[PDB]
Ligand code: HEM
């Protein structure tokens with residue numbers, strides 16, 4: 019359950035999420051687009067869910083993809099800001115899940131974002147310990163789908 | 164259209180938006196809920212769009228309403244952060260409008276949020292000058308609906 023998954027965010031996990039976000043979240047447009055382009059490159063099967071975005075290979079030059087990418091980063095910002103209060107983190111995660119559930123995005127499908135995040139982190143010199151921390155946060159969302 | 168509305172965001176308007184957000188955005192949960200409960204109190208008919216939230220009379224204590232309220236504030240955070248680049252502001256505003264268009268929320272209906280925002284600003288001692296600035300930001304979104 020989402021309530022049990024949120025309890026998995028231990029002290030050190032929260033600290034690593036914050037320290038890495040301080041860097042990653044500093045360039046929401048660049049890192050957001052990088053995450054999406056990587057998702058579409060490593061998992062082409064997901065492109066179907068984003069038909070409204072148009073030609074996703076244009077990257078930064080595609081206004082719709084750019085708008086979506088920047089916006090995606092503010093959801094992560096939201097999650098990070100709620101780490102201090104589990105009750106708030108949970109209500110924000112379930113709120114976030116509503117539209118993804120409507121789109122029939124499964125926990126397994128959502129988990130495909132882990133790869134892209136790990137690569138963005140690595141490009142900023144954040145290794146496996148950080149990727150694992152982020153996978154735990156993604157797991158809270160997966161529990162709500 | 165959205166670009167033209169964005170043109171009404173002059174240097175002084177952006178300055179007042181940023182200065183007031185520095186305060187309003189510092190308590191997203193508190194001010195987000197205040198805005199929503201004020202919307203429901205002054206325009207009860209808008210509750211028709213929020214059946215999923217349940218008993219909105221519970222206010223802050225309602226987890227779904229609290230989740231939505233906090234999340235609403237990150238959309239404004241996004242807008243404020245993109246003020247210095249019209250190209251990014253416009254793509255984020257058009258991205259934001261998509262789900263609201265699907266919900267059949269007209270520009271006139273969306274405009275009902277102006278009163279609640281004006282009241283939230285006044286609670287922090289930000290007068291008409293600031294309320295007018297925010298109405299102009301809301302107008303940019305209205306142009307996309
Ligand atoms: C870290 C992971 C992710 C974050 C933070 C995220 C964030 C968001 C946000 C904030 C929105 C806009 C609000 C909404 O409509 O719900 C959105 C839209 C969307 N998301 Fe997610 N998302 C993530 C991963 C995914 C994945 C893995 C998929 C599909 C495999 C997905 C598919 C969608 C779709 C199709 C839209 C609508 C795109 C459009 O037409 O503009 N998301 N997401």
Ligand code: HEM
Pocket residue numbers: 113116117209212213215216231234235236238239259262263266268272273274275276301
């Ligand atoms: C400055 C004003 C507003 C902001 C920043 C805002 C922000 C948001 C955000 C970020 C979401 C979540 C993503 C999505 O599903 O689109 C959302 C959802 C929603 N918004 Fe807006 N919104 C605003 C005003 C309004 C107004 C005035 C209405 C209707 C009178 C409205 C009705 C909705 C509804 C029904 C949802 C889904 C609620 C749920 O079931 O969780 N919004 N809005």
